[PDB]
């Protein structure tokens, strides 16, 4: 429709049309809205739009249209400001200031258009960042002056100062140069005396609560930077801790101010300051007790009820208490007159800790940690907190989380562990009585018995062995009684699981009591036949968990036993595992492997290994004999599964046995690599017979599974292998023969990225020993993988990630392999690295930059030789300019540090005269010219073309700074960050790069 009219700038702007378009955007819906959105985006991004902004602020009546006009202004002020004539700048300032004064005069508009006012304030503040105080010396005086007249203007001036404070101290680091940040901080710092007087005047006198709140808002910001004298040598602490804590409008902001006050930088050796820090805490807690709620109040109920601002306020109170007590609690611990204040503050925290709010609980839990750690180590402290700590034990236990939530569970365990050391009797009593309230039914639920089990399990190893013994016996006795009481499989399964969880958490007990350990394990075996959901997984996870800790007791011959228990386990393994799913059987075998690794007698270990692998080896041999007699049988998806499952069983035992697994690997190695080939051919055939869609079929994925598990087994062994001579001489050559060509000669969609992964490990462990092998890996995988991944950043993500891992390890361990590449393939290597830079994917990007850095180092290490000479001539400026491209493009900020490091290294090479040949071609520059001078000339030209809005002066200064600073990384980084700011605007100050 006629909506697209505003984008025609040849005519005067029709305000009526603007406001329609804006309304239709904010208040409209569907097709209408989307079209207006595109029109407003186009209007705003018109670079001549700022000119028609004063028209909108005056003539338009729609506060949204005005808001958008200021967004256009804002974009001009931050980017193109310094390019404007000086009269335009005074004009814009005058009518930004003017609009603010007039909006504050009209109480109607002042009350009902805070959005548009606040935006105008932010816009004013952008102008100050440009023009203040060098071209506006009297802003602060004239602001303090115009504060006296109108209460509204005074309120707005507090909002302006808040925003100024934010922009200079809180959000300056990323957004302005170092030189400019310092200038504005020193400028604010200079005139703050005047600003503070006005703030304190308003707080002490105090008319409009809306004014008082806005003043307190601004104070919170000032507290981030102002020196401590302003808080401790005025009356402002008394005001905050008393006056402003009583009324609810000011309470919220004031509590946050005192939180920041608790963080101020303060001399720690002055009694008067110490007393003042005590006083404001005493006042605050008193106002809480008398104006909000007493110490006994059920804060859990309050928080849940969620009336008005209660949740924010209780959050804020926890932050205040934790922050202050973390820093200052020592001040309250010696004086007996402060003892009640100390324990009341902590009693509020106990009550706050009962609140059903995960993130709040974490905040309080961090504090409890700080406290109980201190009570554990610090002399004569714990007695003070006996009753606080007793309550905390119940709070932690009742809110104990499952070990799966790793950060929270760890935090809870540490606190509870400290609390158990400080009073073991109390901890025990609480736990036993909670267990009693499960048995009588009064607190009985699945969730409740679970949490108690996790709690009891958490404190394993804190009690003495004697006490632990009596405690565990009591817990297990009771839980066993609990199981018997309960009816139905649902209930008994829960309790049985918890029984088994606690037992698994107490290995010390298990180790000292063989008969019991034996009984436990036989019971887990019985549970491996239960079909009830969860039970088999619980049985298997507990088994391997117990074994991880108690393995030595499975490998020796216990007294009164006829043999090591591992032998007993292996004999019944078929019967034991008959009803388990494949991946559960695999866990079982891994657990057995752990036990077998404890036997250090080579002869007995090997025998156990072969006994454990009996079933898979017999399955294997029958299947190898069947499938080698006719490759037809591998079509049968039942045979594909059986094969994959035998390999996985081997992966599981190899995972836990590492170097000890070698004999078992030897049993199957040659036939396994033959299977790999037969499988390989089978896959290729299906893809030629059925097309690419074949790779998605169950049959082909089955076959690919076999290959991947074979690659996984070999990777797993080699990564842990101790005898590297056998790896090279027995494993590596057959492996390379089996896999490299197959990879190279399959269509892209049929190639397994796991090949690359396997090869990465082979190069990692034994690359130094197989130079010709590493050449062969490059030849087979390099060019063909690169072609897969150099068309976009999306396709073949695994190959992409494994590719750069493989090149990284080759560049670390066997650089000579890259020297053999013909110059054309070496060029693709440089292309490949630079390609990694441009990735967002962190694994690729980080590897990309590391390869670059290590390559440079490798070339440096070659000394003055023809390949090093010719590498620099060919690829130095490619690396410099490619590194600069991702630094400055705004799309690779995650990589800044590595980019900076790479760039500094590249620049330091020329600065140190570590490149012998000229980097310039004959008669492109006078003959006697150093690389130093040419590098500066090249970079100047490069940046001038890439960023044409920069002055020659700006660029010259940047490079001067950068090259001088190419030994100090943090400063170098600073200079880069300054460059990143300056390119986003026009007329950056070249002197900024002299900052030190």
């Amino acid at each position: 429709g006629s909506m697209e009219g505003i984008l025609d700038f040849s005519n005067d702007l029709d305000i009526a049309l603007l406001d329609q378009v804006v309304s239709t955007f904010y208040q409209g819906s569907g097709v209408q809205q989307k079209q207006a959105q595109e029109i407003l985006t186009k209007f705003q991004d018109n670079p001549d739009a700022w000119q028609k902004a004063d028209q909108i602020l005056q003539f338009s009546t729609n506060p949204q249209s005005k808001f958008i006009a200021l967004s256009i202004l804002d974009k001009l002020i931050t980017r193109k400001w310094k390019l404007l004539p000086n009269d335009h700048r005074i004009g814009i300032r005058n009518f930004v200031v003017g609009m603010i004064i007039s909006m504050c005069q009209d109480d109607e508009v002042f009350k009902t258009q805070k959005n548009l006012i606040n935006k105008s304030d932010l816009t004013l503040v952008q102008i100050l960042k440009q023009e203040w105080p060098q071209n506006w010396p009297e802003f602060i005086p004239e602001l303090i002056g115009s504060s006296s007249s109108s209460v509204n203007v005074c309120e707005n001036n507090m909002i302006v100062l808040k925003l100024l404070s934010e922009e200079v101290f809180d959000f300056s680091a990323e957004q302005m140069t170092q030189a400019k940040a310092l200038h504005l901080k020193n400028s604010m710092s200079k005139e703050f005396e005047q600003i503070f007087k006005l703030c304190f005047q308003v707080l002490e006198q105090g008319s409009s609560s809306s004014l008082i709140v806005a003043t307190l808002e601004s104070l919170l910001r000032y507290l981030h930077w102002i020196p401590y004298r302003y808080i401790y040598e005025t009356n402002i602490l008394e005001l905050l801790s008393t006056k402003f804590m009583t009324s609810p409008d000011t309470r919220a902001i004031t509590l946050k101010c005192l939180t920041e006050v608790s963080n101020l930088k303060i001399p720690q050796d002055n009694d008067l300051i110490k007393r003042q820090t005590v006083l404001f805490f005493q006042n605050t807690l008193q106002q809480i007790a008398t104006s909000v709620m007493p110490v006994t109040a059920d804060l859990k109920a309050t928080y849940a009820n969620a009336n008005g601002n209660d949740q924010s306020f209780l959050q804020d109170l926890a932050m205040f208490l934790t922050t202050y007590l973390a820093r200052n609690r020592a001040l309250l611990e010696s004086d007996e007159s402060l003892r009640e204040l100390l324990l009341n503050a902590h009693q509020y925290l106990i009550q706050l800790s009962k609140i059903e709010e995960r993130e709040l609980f974490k905040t309080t839990l961090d504090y409890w940690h700080n406290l109980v750690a201190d009570l554990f180590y610090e002399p004569l402290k714990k007695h003070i907190y006996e009753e606080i700590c007793s309550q905390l034990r119940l709070v932690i236990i009742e809110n104990m989380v499952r070990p799966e939530e790793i950060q929270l569970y760890k935090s809870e365990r540490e606190v509870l562990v400290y609390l158990t050391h400080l009073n073991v009797i109390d901890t025990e009593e609480i736990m036993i009585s909670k267990l009693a309230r499960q048995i009588d039914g009064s607190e009985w639920s699945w969730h409740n018995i679970n949490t108690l089990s996790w709690a009891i399990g958490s404190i394993s190893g804190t009690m003495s062995e004697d006490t632990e013994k009596r405690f565990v016996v009591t817990v297990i006795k009771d839980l066993l009684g609990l199981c018997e009481q309960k009816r139905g499989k649902d209930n008994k399964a829960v309790v049985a699981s918890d029984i088994m969880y606690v037992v698994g958490q107490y290995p010390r007990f298990l180790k000292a009591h063989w008969n019991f350990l034996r009984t436990v394990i036989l019971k887990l075996f019985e549970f491996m036949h239960e079909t009830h959901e969860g039970v088999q997984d619980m049985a298997c996870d507990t088994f391997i968990k117990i074994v991880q800790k108690c393995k030595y007791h499975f490998v020796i011959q216990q007294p009164r036993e006829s043999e090591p228990f591992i032998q007993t386990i292996i004999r019944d393994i078929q019967k034991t595992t008959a009803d388990l799913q494949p991946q559960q059987v695999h866990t079982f075998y891994k657990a057995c492997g752990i036990i077998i690794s404890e036997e250090r007698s080579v002869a007995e270990r090997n025998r156990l290994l072969s006994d454990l692998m009996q079933l898979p080896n017999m399955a294997w041999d029958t299947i190898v004999e069947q499938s080698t007699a006719n490759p037809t049988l591998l079509l049968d998806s039942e045979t594909v599964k059986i094969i994959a499952n035998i390999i996985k069983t081997n992966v599981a035992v190899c995972t836990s046995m590492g170097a000890d697994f070698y004999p078992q690997l030897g049993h199957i190695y040659y036939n396994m690599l033959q299977l790999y080939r037969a499988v390989s051919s089978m896959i290729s055939a299906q893809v030629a017979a059925e097309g690419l869609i074949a790779t998605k079929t169950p049959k082909v994925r089955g076959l690919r599974t076999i290959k991947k598990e074979i690659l996984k087994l070999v990777e797993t062994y080699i990564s842990k292998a101790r005898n590297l001579d056998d790896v090279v001489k027995v494993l590596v050559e057959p492996l390379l023969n089996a896999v490299l060509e197959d990879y190279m000669n399959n269509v892209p969609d049929a190639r397994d990225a796991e090949v690359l992964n396997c090869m990465t490990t082979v190069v990692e462990k034994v690359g130094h020993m197989i130079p010709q092998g590493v050449i062969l890996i490059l030849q087979s995988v390099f060019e063909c993988t690169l072609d897969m991944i150099n068309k976009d950043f999306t396709e073949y993500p695994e190959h992409r990630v494994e590719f750069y891992k493989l090149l990284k390890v080759i560049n670390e361990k066997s650089f000579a392999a890259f020297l053999e590449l013909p110059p054309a393939a070496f060029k693709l290597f440089v292309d490949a690295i630079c390609w990694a830079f441009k990735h967002n994917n962190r694994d690729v990007e980080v590897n990309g930059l590391q390869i670059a850095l290590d390559l440079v180092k490798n070339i440096e290490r070659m000394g003055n030789v023809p390949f090093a000479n010719e590498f620099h001539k060919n690829y130095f400026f490619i690396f410099v300019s490619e590194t600069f491209f991702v630094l400055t493009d705004s799309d690779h900020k995650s990589g800044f540090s590595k980019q900076a490091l790479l760039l500094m290294k590249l620049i330091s090479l020329v600065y140190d005269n570590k490149i012998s040949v000229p980097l310039y071609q004959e008669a492109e520059v006078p003959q006697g010219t150093s690389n130093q001078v040419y590098l500066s000339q090249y970079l100047a030209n490069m940046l001038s073309n890439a960023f044409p809005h920069l002055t020659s002066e700006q660029i010259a200064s940047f490079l001067s700074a950068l090259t001088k600073q190419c030994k100090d990384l943090v400063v170098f980084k600073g200079t880069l960050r300054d460059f990143l700011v300056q390119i986003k605007e026009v007329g950056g100050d070249p002197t900024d790069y002299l900052f030190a």
């Binding site: 297990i476 066993l480 199981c483 139905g488 008969n515 009984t519 436990v520 019971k523 549970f527 239960e530």
Partner: peptide, 17 residues
Amino acid sequence: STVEDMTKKFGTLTIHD
């Protein structure tokens, strides 16, 4: 034999009625 006592009770643990 409080441990032996508990071990014997453990051995009769079931999920069944």
